Design a protein around this motif. Structure first.
Motif, PDB file in Angstrom:
ATOM      1  N   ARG A   1       0.354   3.258 -16.031  1.00  0.00           N
ATOM      2  CA  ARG A   1       2.186   2.932 -15.322  1.00  0.00           C
ATOM      3  C   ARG A   1       2.692   1.595 -15.549  1.00  0.00           C
ATOM      4  N   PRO A   2       3.560   1.116 -15.229  1.00  0.00           N
ATOM      5  CA  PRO A   2       4.316   0.225 -15.257  1.00  0.00           C
ATOM      6  C   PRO A   2       4.518  -0.604 -14.096  1.00  0.00           C
ATOM      7  N   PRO A   3       3.905  -2.283 -13.705  1.00  0.00           N
ATOM      8  CA  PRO A   3       3.692  -2.272 -12.683  1.00  0.00           C
ATOM      9  C   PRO A   3       4.306  -2.663 -11.898  1.00  0.00           C
ATOM     10  N   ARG A   4       4.370  -1.985 -10.155  1.00  0.00           N
ATOM     11  CA  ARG A   4       5.119  -2.580  -9.345  1.00  0.00           C
ATOM     12  C   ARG A   4       5.672  -3.271  -9.482  1.00  0.00           C
ATOM     13  N   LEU A   5       6.847  -3.606  -8.818  1.00  0.00           N
ATOM     14  CA  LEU A   5       7.798  -4.971  -9.252  1.00  0.00           C
ATOM     15  C   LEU A   5       8.305  -5.093  -7.640  1.00  0.00           C
ATOM     16  N   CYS A   6       8.701  -4.115  -6.876  1.00  0.00           N
ATOM     17  CA  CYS A   6       8.953  -4.831  -5.808  1.00  0.00           C
ATOM     18  C   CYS A   6       8.149  -5.423  -4.809  1.00  0.00           C
ATOM     19  N   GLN A   7       8.083  -5.527  -3.426  1.00  0.00           N
ATOM     20  CA  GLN A   7       6.740  -5.719  -3.244  1.00  0.00           C
ATOM     21  C   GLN A   7       6.888  -4.282  -1.644  1.00  0.00           C
ATOM     22  N   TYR A   8       5.305  -4.841  -1.305  1.00  0.00           N
ATOM     23  CA  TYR A   8       5.022  -3.397  -0.729  1.00  0.00           C
ATOM     24  C   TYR A   8       5.397  -3.375   0.738  1.00  0.00           C
ATOM     25  N   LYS A   9       5.700  -2.199   1.452  1.00  0.00           N
ATOM     26  CA  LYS A   9       5.742  -2.366   2.684  1.00  0.00           C
ATOM     27  C   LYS A   9       4.978  -1.907   3.630  1.00  0.00           C
ATOM     28  N   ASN A  10       3.729  -0.701   3.674  1.00  0.00           N
ATOM     29  CA  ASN A  10       3.027  -0.138   3.697  1.00  0.00           C
ATOM     30  C   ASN A  10       2.293   0.651   3.273  1.00  0.00           C
ATOM     31  N   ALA A  11       1.220   0.797   3.563  1.00  0.00           N
ATOM     32  CA  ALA A  11      -0.160   1.495   3.480  1.00  0.00           C
ATOM     33  C   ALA A  11      -0.366   3.076   3.258  1.00  0.00           C
ATOM     34  N   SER A  12       0.937   3.002   3.973  1.00  0.00           N
ATOM     35  CA  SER A  12       0.918   5.046   3.596  1.00  0.00           C
ATOM     36  C   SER A  12       1.943   5.342   2.505  1.00  0.00           C
ATOM     37  N   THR A  13       2.950   4.818   2.595  1.00  0.00           N
ATOM     38  CA  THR A  13       4.094   4.866   1.444  1.00  0.00           C
ATOM     39  C   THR A  13       4.653   4.001   0.740  1.00  0.00           C
ATOM     40  N   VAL A  14       4.869   4.460  -1.119  1.00  0.00           N
ATOM     41  CA  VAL A  14       5.420   3.626  -1.939  1.00  0.00           C
ATOM     42  C   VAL A  14       6.825   3.109  -1.686  1.00  0.00           C
ATOM     43  N   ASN A  15       7.798   3.552  -0.302  1.00  0.00           N
ATOM     44  CA  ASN A  15       8.396   2.708   0.296  1.00  0.00           C
ATOM     45  C   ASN A  15       9.045   1.619  -0.271  1.00  0.00           C
ATOM     46  N   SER A  60      14.643   5.674   1.414  1.00  0.00           N
ATOM     47  CA  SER A  60      15.892   4.929   1.430  1.00  0.00           C
ATOM     48  C   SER A  60      15.844   3.700   2.397  1.00  0.00           C
ATOM     49  N   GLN A  61      15.511   3.880   3.796  1.00  0.00           N
ATOM     50  CA  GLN A  61      14.915   3.940   5.155  1.00  0.00           C
ATOM     51  C   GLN A  61      13.349   2.906   4.896  1.00  0.00           C
ATOM     52  N   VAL A  62      12.683   1.906   4.428  1.00  0.00           N
ATOM     53  CA  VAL A  62      11.410   1.794   3.950  1.00  0.00           C
ATOM     54  C   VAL A  62      10.849   2.145   4.448  1.00  0.00           C
ATOM     55  N   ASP A  63      10.804   2.455   6.305  1.00  0.00           N
ATOM     56  CA  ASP A  63       9.909   2.292   6.935  1.00  0.00           C
ATOM     57  C   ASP A  63      10.421   4.333   7.541  1.00  0.00           C
ATOM     58  N   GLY A  64      10.414   5.009   6.399  1.00  0.00           N
ATOM     59  CA  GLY A  64      10.470   6.308   6.698  1.00  0.00           C
ATOM     60  C   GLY A  64      10.092   8.051   5.368  1.00  0.00           C
ATOM     61  N   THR A  65      10.167   8.570   5.488  1.00  0.00           N
ATOM     62  CA  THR A  65      10.038  10.162   5.297  1.00  0.00           C
ATOM     63  C   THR A  65      10.743  10.780   4.296  1.00  0.00           C
ATOM     64  N   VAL A  66      10.781  10.479   3.078  1.00  0.00           N
ATOM     65  CA  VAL A  66      11.549  12.168   2.157  1.00  0.00           C
ATOM     66  C   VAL A  66      11.659  13.128   2.883  1.00  0.00           C
TER      67      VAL A  66
END
Ligand SMILES: CCCCCCCCCCCCC/C=C\[C@H](O)[C@H](N)CO
Ligand SMILES: CCCCCCCCCCCCC/C=C\[C@H](O)[C@H](N)CO
Lengths: 251, 59, 238, 285, 285, 238, 59, 238, 59
Positions: free
Chosen positions: D249-263, A125-131
């Motif tokens: 898989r469906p193409p991504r919709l929301c913009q990327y935040k970081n290279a670690s996570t899919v947040n 939920s926090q974009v800079d975070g971890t589940v």
């Protein structure tokens, strides 16, 4: 044409308004063959104690209810002798048969999507975070989407329209899916082979796939139709091997 | 000398090219831009029983 | 040694060229292949899959599942138009984010016909007939069912088989059409009207919903790769 | 010895003719509840003329789609500085810092391919007061550090001896340095996604970082220091050859935040129009 | 005329199945006193499943292991100086001044091979007060002095006429100077080790220096002097081709001291752990 | 002359490339070969040879031959664990300096199974039985023989044939394993316990010693050459 | 013209390359990276009498 | 690799060279051909088509259709010359703007013979005979019909078949002739005179008109491409 | 090796050249400067009925 029966182990499922059976990619569950295998030792194959129909507790489809998701395995980890071999063994392999069961009358209306998603990596939920791990899976208790954008640390961003993965929730039709349209059918069946990039893989670490049930068209009824409409999910492993036995894990 | 003469990409409505590989590793080759295959029924029609496009989908 | 002579275009780096090149890891032994299920071999296999279409993308409903469902009710609503939208599978906000649209937006030309499948999502006792019409371009959108009647239409009877397929054929002069469509390579517009109306017994709801799934027919094709305008960043690490 | 290879071209299906119909065959009525996508060619709904169709789905195959070079990292390093860690560039390898090729590769869950890697290295003289010098051509070393090898601590380290790590020396002014790379993985396919952890207690790191460890890259100026500062920028281009891909898989919709996570942040499904009935009127005097 | 060569790939042995056993065959009990290494495949101790094994021992053959270039000397020389012996580099040839390729070659007692020698020569302008000049490209001469020839005393000697000694002129800015070298030895194999002397009275010099005399190398700037000083550094890279090797030895443990001798300081066998029973607990919430 | 065109990667020096190159000594006449005994043709022939394993590498015994021998005595010591160590043939201090370990540390991936051969080095009249167990990873090391009993074990009876081979099989999911192992590609741990104990007559010593020899089975392989971290210098002439 | 077309290194689960030698000396050739041979019994089992892996090593 | 050696003319850009060159759009799928009518396969097919010749290009008539028509009248006008012009199909103002002339002016040499077809454009009852003569070069243009009579002539009788073809043959010494003609490669001059005169009945007009169409015979050819002097600009965007 | 030896342009009153195509696309070839064809009667004589050059154009 609409009748069907599925006999697995000592368990049977009868249905009378089934649409069809999605076999994930035209592919049926099978055992690991000798030339695609990598582990040296002999696998356990219990075959009737583990490949049967385990029923998870049921959820109440309300008029304003976004959706639900389960993660397999880690849902069947406390289910009988699947959830025990799964403890004592390092490596496990299995496909599944998911039967979702939701029945209403002829005066009710609605439409669920029933979709299996491989590797449904999710976004906090926090974009800079971890589940957390709890935020991905509660076991047999389903996690719930939200009709608005969620907040709070470590909890998946579970607004329905993005489905927690950052994609469009209407494109999920690329995955093996069915619908439950309360005017035609009352059960969806998806037969899901072992989709993963290694022959066998641990069962506590990797949520091999995710089952999402998302009502696109919501419930509705009139004067005194039955207010309570539940949804029940049954999963049944298929062609289940395990390898690498040792003392039991603990969490 | 270990060559292979395949066909070029021409439209429809002197067309053969020559290939020789120089390196000892198949990770050094060109790309396989001339394989066109399909099987949409894998995603388009992933169902157990067939559906024949002129009969009711049910019944 | 051999006398060679270098032609123009030497010592350049063209992004879309395929030459051979030295392996930096000689005699590597790659991991044996695995018959993982579900292998893609073309992109027009991802664009022949149905996808729910956000038709009702009025404002206030864009982050709601309500964007996906067309409202339909019972009564004398024959004067009202159910829905209508341009055929622009790569540019119209209704389409540009489907699987068809998101696959097109990596290309610059598209030809072929489209399949729009409608799903009636009301009671098992509600009954209605609908008219679904496509109008090849050349004249303003129809504003009455007597004009939509003149197009390329279908009359969908709601019954046991819930859904009904309106196959937008390929009528054009150019063999292809831009994805960034203009009013030269325009494609038309589809519109939906009641043919008889919705009729429900006592004790069932009156407000039902339709839904529309877009896919590409078996003669669709796209060409001239381009970049997609939908992804964008403002620094590395993104 | 010459060998003839046969290359078949795959056209798209022609349009068979049709006529009036009055029958109990309903090729239109279906039931999407079955997870099945209707196959209704136009010749089933209307009257069509026979059309020989020559079009081809060639530029949409996976090999034609992905096999195009794209930048995946940009990094700068100086000939002289007062940090000794800005004299060389360094980074762990992933295709995940640039949104374009990331999103492109991420329509599929498992991608298995070889690559063709290219480097575009461009130096500039740093802006200052006293410019003017005669420096000879700069030459650069690009070392690949697999996971485990010793990593440099300066541009005068011993590690740059590159006894077993592969590394490229390139003297500025020539064609870019390019080489080819096999499927260097331990799984059976690069897994763009991963719904899991590293530790068996169901905690640790989540998702992609767990799986893929492919080592680092370190770039440096071989020449030596410089009378007046200069700064070089290296861009790295990946082009996947011999491409196999699974489970779209469906193409991504929301913009990327970081290279670690899919947040991500939640975004709208699509953009708005005036009504649901709105088609603009474009035939107007 | 084209000739087809047959190249067989050597996989590793599959795992044959097995079942229960109750017999007087003990494939486990053995006796290491015989200098014999037990051949107990897992299928002898437990119950195994048939496993077709496709792995290959290719990147561990001796040719794949050794045939990789590695630096074996670095030396500097100036265009101008006040020493006249720092205007050119010079050194006797051995693979023994860099620890990496030394230790690599020294798992075997006798190594017989050809080589591919490469030179990486990189000049830098010396730091000073008055920089700035237009010097043309430098060109270098690399002369090989076999054992016996006359060796230079300056960069303006007569010896650099290289009438019979092979020598390379290379003008800076091109690809490095590379050439190939046969098995230039008088024994039947290069002897990495030697337990003996030179004089028959059992004295003299001990070990390697006795045996191998392969001459020297001398590098110089052909151009001439320079208005302002500059210094060039030459690195030499050996890559053994067509490699044959005999009588393997345990890899070196202690660090090297000099290039003459195998002298060393005593080191520990391995590093410590807490107890003899210590395995760390890594499954923990 | 011929028109050529130079591709990227021209005029570079890649350390691991094999091209032809001019001979600097043309028409040289090499010395005839000699059938010297003991020719190596692969490196997995140096890693299939036994090597004494420094198991007892506690502090204070690292420069002693005592590092090589496991202490074992007579009496009621069934509660005590004889030894135990992780399976990490390239990273564990117990292994990283064997022939197997020193050969692995030139590579980055390793697959295959291992053979650990134990040698009882006591009297000719001492008698005991030992349990030697390997536990595939997934759970903390066993702390009692009732848990080690559940692994992949062997029960070694000490008699005429002195030594006994515990063959650690290859149980893994990935076809390969890093040499610089992490807790993803972990491999397990072996542990040794008394099964009945040591029994000696009068007049023989009570404190005996075991020893452990590690070698690679006939299906071992290593790949992805790298540099070894065990050798290092700080200037030329070393 | 004095060529030789051998096989590349591909994994298991258009693969032939061409070689021509240009120089008058075999010390100028490539490396023989495609010979894989073994004989571990030279170091592994260097004993006079054989030992048969299912009989006691003694007795 | 192969020892090559670069010859002069390397790394230059010669405008009129045809080498191969990398495609910047690989595996493009071009639009199917169309059998559009009227395909040109040579330029001497545009120069074998008749073209009205502006003979009467005196001043004051250059932007008038009157430039195209030769005046001819009835009466005793036998002393007067009807028309006359040099044969210079690429340089003479009479020719340099025809189809023949505008096609020649892209070339530097021209050989072949020419066809000049004259069309009498008067009443259907006017009658006359004309003399049309070509004089190979070597002497000043004829100034009387007794000299034009000596050339290579034709006598055209005006009747039902209106038009008449004077085919200027190819008399030259050089196989070719410059297009920018000088008095070395001069070609001659044609001249036209009354043979008997025009006779009209009462009630028809007396002043008639001829017209002249130039085309190239079936043995014409041009060579040595050059630029045309007729188009010119003074900045981009033109 | 996929070549084609055609004839050079010599005048009238050791003439064969060699071509090999290197690229996978026919839009990369040379130009077809050696096709000489004609049909002027398309523009020169575009009439329904023929006219025979020795008969009156009418009548
Ligand atoms: C000097 C040579 C330097 C080259 C470095 C190349 C590294 C090879 C790694 C291949 C990377 C592929 C990506 O990890 C995958 N596409 C992940 O999806
Ligand atoms: C100019 C040419 C200069 C090249 C000089 C090459 C010298 C050849 C000597 C070969 C040396 C090999 C080592 O002595 C052996 N590996 C010793 O183990």
């Amino acid at each position: 044409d609409r009748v069907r029966s599925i006999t697995l182990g000592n368990s049977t499922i009868t249905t009378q308004e089934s649409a069809n059976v999605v076999v994930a990619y035209g592919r049926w569950p099978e055992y690991l063959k000798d030339n695609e295998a990598t582990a040296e030792d002999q696998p356990t194959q219990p075959d009737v104690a583990t490949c049967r129909f385990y029923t998870l507790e049921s959820v109440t489809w309300e008029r304003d209810s976004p959706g639900w998701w389960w993660k397999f395995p880690d849902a069947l980890k406390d289910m009988g002798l699947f959830g025990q071999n799964m403890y004592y063994h390092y490596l496990g392999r299995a496909g599944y048969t998911i039967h979702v069961q939701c029945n209403a009358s002829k005066f009710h209306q609605g439409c669920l999507m029933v979709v299996c998603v491989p590797e449904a990596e999710m976004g906090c939920s926090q974009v800079d975070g971890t589940v957390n791990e709890h935020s991905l899976s509660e076991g047999e208790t389903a996690k719930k989407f939200a009709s608005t954008s969620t907040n709070g640390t470590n909890t998946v961003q579970s607004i329905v329209t993005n489905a927690g993965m950052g994609v469009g929730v209407g494109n999920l039709t690329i995955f093996p899916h069915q619908w439950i349209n309360l005017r035609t059918n009352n059960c969806a069946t998806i037969v899901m082979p072992y989709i993963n990039n290694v022959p066998m893989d641990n069962m506590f670490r990797h949520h091999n796939f995710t089952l999402m049930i998302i009502p696109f068209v919501p419930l509705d009824y009139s004067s005194d139709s039955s207010t309570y409409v539940p949804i029940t999910v049954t999963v049944a492993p298929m062609c289940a091997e395990y390898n690498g036995l040792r003392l039991a894990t603990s969490l | 000398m270990g060559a292979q003469v395949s066909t070029q990409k021409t439209g429809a409505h002197i067309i053969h090219y020559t290939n020789i590989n120089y390196y000892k590793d198949a990770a050094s080759n060109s790309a396989n831009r001339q394989d066109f295959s399909q099987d949409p029924g894998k995603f388009t029609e992933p169902v157990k029983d067939i559906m024949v496009k002129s009969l009711p989908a049910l019944n | 040694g051999l006398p060679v002579m270098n032609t123009p275009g030497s010592n350049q780096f063209l992004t879309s060229d395929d030459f051979q090149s030295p392996s930096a890891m000689p005699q590597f032994d790659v991991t044996p292949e695995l018959n993982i299920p579900g292998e893609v071999q073309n992109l027009m296999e991802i664009a022949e899959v149905d996808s729910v279409v956000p038709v009702n993308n009025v404002e206030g409903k864009l982050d709601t599942m309500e964007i996906y469902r067309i409202p339909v009710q019972s009564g004398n609503h024959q004067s009202s138009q159910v829905f209508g939208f341009q055929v622009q599978p790569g540019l119209d906000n209704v389409f540009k984010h489907t699987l068809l649209g998101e696959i097109l937006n990596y290309y610059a030309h598209w030809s072929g016909s489209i399949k729009l499948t409608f799903v009636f999502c009301g009671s098992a006792m509600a009954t209605g007939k609908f008219l679904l019409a496509y109008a090849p371009p050349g004249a303003n959108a129809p504003k009455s069912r007597k004009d939509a009647m003149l197009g390329t239409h279908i009359i969908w009877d709601v019954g046991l088989q819930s859904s009904c397929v309106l196959c937008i054929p390929w009528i054009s002069q150019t063999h292809y059409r831009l994805v960034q469509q203009d009013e030269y390579t325009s494609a038309g517009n589809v519109t939906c009207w009641y043919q008889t109306g919705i009729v429900v017994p006592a004790g069932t709801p009156t407000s039902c919903s339709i839904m529309c799934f877009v896919s590409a027919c078996n003669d669709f094709s796209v060409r001239l790769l381009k970049d997609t305008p939908f992804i964008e960043q403002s620094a590395l690490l993104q | 010895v010459v060998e003839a290879v046969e290359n078949a071209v795959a056209r798209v299906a022609d349009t068979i003719s049709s006529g009036p119909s009055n029958s109990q065959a309903v090729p239109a009525l279906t039931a999407v509840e079955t997870g099945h996508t209707s196959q209704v060619t136009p010749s089933d709904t209307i009257q069509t003329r026979h059309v020989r169709n020559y079009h081809s789905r060639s530029e949409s195959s996976i090999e034609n789609f992905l096999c195009r070079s794209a930048c995946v990292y940009m990094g700068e390093y100086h000939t002289t500085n007062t940090d000794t860690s800005k004299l060389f560039a360094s980074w762990t390898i992933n295709a995940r810092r640039m949104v374009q090729m990331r999103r492109k590769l991420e329509l599929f869950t498992y991608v298995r391919f070889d690559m063709e890697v290219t480097f575009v290295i461009t130096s500039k003289q740093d802006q200052g007061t006293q410019l003017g010098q005669d420096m000879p051509p700069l030459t650069h070393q690009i070392m690949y550090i697999p996971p485990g090898g010793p990593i440099p601590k300066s541009v005068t380290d011993y590690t740059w001896q590159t006894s077993t790590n592969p590394s490229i020396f390139w003297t500025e002014g020539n064609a870019p340095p390019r080489m080819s790379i096999p499927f260097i993985s331990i799984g059976n396919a690069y897994s763009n996604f991963y719904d899991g952890w590293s530790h068996f207690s169901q905690n640790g790191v989540y998702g992609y970082n767990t799986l893929n460890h492919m080592g680092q890259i370190y770039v440096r100026h071989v020449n030596g220091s410089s009378p007046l500062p200069m700064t070089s920028t290296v861009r790295m281009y990946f082009k996947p050859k011999h491409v196999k891909v699974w489970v779209p898989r469906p193409p991504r919709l929301c913009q990327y935040k970081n290279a670690s996570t899919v947040n991500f942040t939640p975004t709208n499904i699509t953009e708005k129009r005036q009504s649901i009935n709105y088609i603009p009127e474009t035939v107007k005097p």
